[PDB]
Every structure is written in structure tokens, then in C-alpha cells.
Amino acid sequence: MELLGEYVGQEGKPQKLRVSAPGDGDPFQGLLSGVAQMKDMVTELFDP
Amino acid sequence: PAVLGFEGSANKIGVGVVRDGKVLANPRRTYVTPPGTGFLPGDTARHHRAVILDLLQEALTESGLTSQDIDCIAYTKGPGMGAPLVSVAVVARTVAQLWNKPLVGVNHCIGHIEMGRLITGATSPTVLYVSGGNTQVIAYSEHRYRIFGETIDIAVGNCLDRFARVLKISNDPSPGYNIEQMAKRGKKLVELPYTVKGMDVSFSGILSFIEDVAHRMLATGECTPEDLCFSLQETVFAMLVEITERAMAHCGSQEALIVGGVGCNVRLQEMMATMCQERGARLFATDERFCIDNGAMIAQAGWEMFRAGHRTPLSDSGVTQRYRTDEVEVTWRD
Amino acid sequence: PHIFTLSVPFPTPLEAEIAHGSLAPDAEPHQRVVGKDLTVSGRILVVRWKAEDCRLLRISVINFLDQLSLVVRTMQRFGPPVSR
Ligand SMILES: [Mg+2]
């Protein structure tokens, strides 16, 4: 359905990450794509 | 029973299949880094993740066995590098659950010992376990592989590997093997510290000494890199022979078995076999297929463990970077 | 403390349970600095991180996603799970 990450710093300000279908395609292929996309968002969130 | 074994505690990744004393498959890959560099946990775990599933299917296909022909899944619980141990364990745990098979967490040293005992047919030897990660003198007694002697700092293989890095010697097929080939051409014996501590050994001092002797050579050139490979081997192997002999004498052992990556070295084998000859003892040594870390050694120790009633529930399957040889209850021996 | 929560959906509750069974046993390498907790409800795997350091929290989350990707590839290539 949806892969999501929620970061809450020591300040208390919450930052959300999310990756966007159960159709004819392979379910694990879709999940692998989401995980790879989540790695990019986590990198982008923590780098600055 | 047939056991599927997973190994990737250092820079070697392998999947083995063992069935009633027969190795049915043993594919393996080695993570080779540029000369002068050492493999890091992060990059090593990345290499292992990229090839582990290819090795698993290679092992299944070569063995002729399918998922449901496998009776047990064995994997290295430890010791070793953190990131690579976790990557191998997550796969072992997944296939165990998928196929609904039991799981057995194996101690890396017991893997080497059990494979050593299977291949060579050693009855009651004094065991010398030498690699890049370990240096121990072991003897089986009352359901324990007891540590009689060991390195108090770095493993003998770590001393050899780091010396190859300072001389910028190739890591292909292994820094150890290339040190060994260079040592054969050595003509001058350079004196080095001899640091035996009763039944224990030390290699930190020898490595720092030979590092300084190497930097002296690149600047003055009194000797050759071949002389230093020869000299390092003569010192570290004579020290390993001494502590093995001291353990053999204290237990009345008539057999000696060398296991681990450094056990591949024909010069160390020659030196140990000579000490054994003068004592009236036998020297046992495995070949290139099994001296280096491999999945079949894990499947073999796993086979012994599974039959005796050892099981690792998933909740207790967590890997340990420190797992001592004497911490396993050897219930498969009398 | 620095907190990170990850929610991962799986095709079936059994595949979520298998991923939990495979990923949960390992202790974090720097336990005093970064800790994590894994739970599973239905098809959802929930990972909860608590950290003292931001860089080591990023490293832990990235390392986990790489292990999760490997587990997903294992289930795809060597599955489906046999009936039990
Ligand atoms: Mg080894």
C-alpha cells in the first residue's frame, strides 16, 4: 500500500517521508522499488 | 540428513550442501580489494548481499537437492564482522521460514574444526586454528572445544594481511597466498621479535617492527620484499609451532590438525609436520577447497549439531561479533 | 531523543511475519547510541528507532533498508512460503 517514515527530532518538529499499485505487476518488484526510493528520501532528510 | 550451510563472516561468502559426510556443493566468492587496502565491514556486507542468492541457487542446483530435500538450515552465528554476519543470517532465517525448516546458529571455529575432522579423519588432535580473525590452540575435552592458548592481540592472518598492505602486495587470490609465493624467493633471514607467552602468542609487536623494517627498505634497500615475506613467515610460524607443541605435550596428543585460512600455507604445514615428525606424531591438514571460509564447513558442524538436538529459535538467532569457541556444548561427541 | 518510525507493507500477513522473524533477532551495533524495535500487525512491519546521534540514526535506517531489500529478494526468488 504505502511505505512511510516519520522523523521526530529532539526539538519535537515532525518530518514525514512517503513512497507511493496492486495491479497485474509483481508485488515484490513494487516493494523493492519503494525500499530503494525510501533509501533516497532518508539520505535527503538526514544530509542537511 | 542434508544440511544447507551459509558462511560470510569475513570477506569470503559461501553456500554449502552436506549430506551424511558428503559435500554435495560448496560455491564461494571472495571480496578482493585493491593492493594496500583492507576490506571494510560495510563494503564487505554489500558484496555479500549482491551474490548470496546466486550462490544459494548454485548450491541447490549443483547438489541436485530441492528445498524440501534439505533437513536443516545452518548459518554462522559468529564470531566475525557485524554487517556481513547480519546479511548472511537474514537470508538463512528467511529460507528456514519459507521452507519451514529448523535453523542452527554455528560457531565459525567449530565449523572449521568439524570440516577439518570430516575431510582429514582426525581422531583426537590438538587443533591449531589460524586465520585473519582467529589464532587459537584448541583441544576437545568433556563436551567443550577448550582454548589452551591464543593470541592476546591480533590473529596471525591479520599480521600477514596488514604486512601485505604496507608492501602494497596484491589481495588476489589472497594477501596471505601472495606473501607465501614471495617468501619462496626470499634469501636473507631478517631477525624479528619472537613473542611467545607460555601457551599464548602476540603479533602486534612483530607487525610494528617489520613495518619499520619495510619503510627502512623502501628508503635504503638492504634487503628485498621477498626476504621480509620469508622472514615474517619463519618467525610467526615457528611461534605457532611452539604453542601447538606445548599443548600437545600437556595432553599427550599424537595428532595435530591445522584449520583456518592460514592452514593453507604449505610452509607452515611443513614446519608443523616437522615438529610432529620429531615427536612421533601425525600432522593433519585440509586442502584449498576447505582451509578458507566456506559454506560446507557450516553445513558440516550444523549436521553434527542438528542430529545431537541443537536448535536455534528465531528469537535467539541474533548474530554475535564475539562468540568464543568454548561457549558451545559439544553434545555430538563423548 | 531522535525518533524514526518506518512502516512497511507486505503482500500477505505470513510474508510480513517472515520478514519480522528474519530482521528482528539482531542487536543494533551501537546499542547505547541507537536502538530499534520491530513489531508486526497484519501485513505491516513497524520499525521504531530511538537515537542519541543523528548520523548514526541515518546509518542504522539505511543499513536496515538494505537488509529488508535482501529479505524481499529472498522471498521473491525462493518463495512462496510452503503451507504450514
Ligand atoms: Mg575462518
Author numbering:
A (entry chain D): 1 to 20, 23 to 50
B (entry chain K): 2 to 335
C (entry chain B): 60 to 143
What's in the article?
The t6A biosynthesis pathway consists of two steps: firstly, the YRDC enzyme (Sua5 in yeast) synthesizes an unstable threonylcarbamoyl-AMP intermediate (TC-AMP) and in a second step, the KEOPS protein complex transfers the TC-moiety from TC-AMP onto the tRNA substrate. The eukaryotic KEOPS complex contains five subunits GON7/LAGE3/OSGEP/TP53RK/TPRKB that are arranged linearly in that order. OSGEP is the catalytic subunit that carries out the TC-transfer reaction and its orthologs are present in virtually all sequenced genomes. The other subunits are essential for the t6A modification of tRNA, but their precise roles are as yet unknown, especially that of GON7, an intrinsically disordered protein (IDP), which was only recently identified in humans.
Furthermore, we determine the crystal structure of the GON7/LAGE3/OSGEP KEOPS subcomplex showing that GON7 becomes structured upon binding to LAGE3. We obtained 1.9 Å resolution diffraction data of the GON7/LAGE3/OSGEP complex. LAGE3 is at the center of the complex, binding on one side to OSGEP and on the other to GON7, which does not directly interact with OSGEP. The two helices of LAGE3 associate with the N-terminal helices of OSGEP into a helical bundle. Only 45% of the GON7 sequence adopts a well-defined structure upon binding to LAGE3, confirming our SAXS- and NMR-based conclusions. The N-terminal peptide of GON7 forms a β-hairpin between Met1 and Ser20 and the region between Gly25 and Pro50 forms a helix that lies parallel against the β-hairpin. The β-hairpin of GON7 aligns with the β-sheet of LAGE3 to form a continuous five stranded anti-parallel sheet. The helix of GON7 packs in an anti-parallel orientation against the C-terminal helix of LAGE3. The association mode between GON7 and LAGE3 is very similar to that of the yeast Pcc1/Gon7 complex, illustrated by their superposition (RMSD = 1.4 Å).
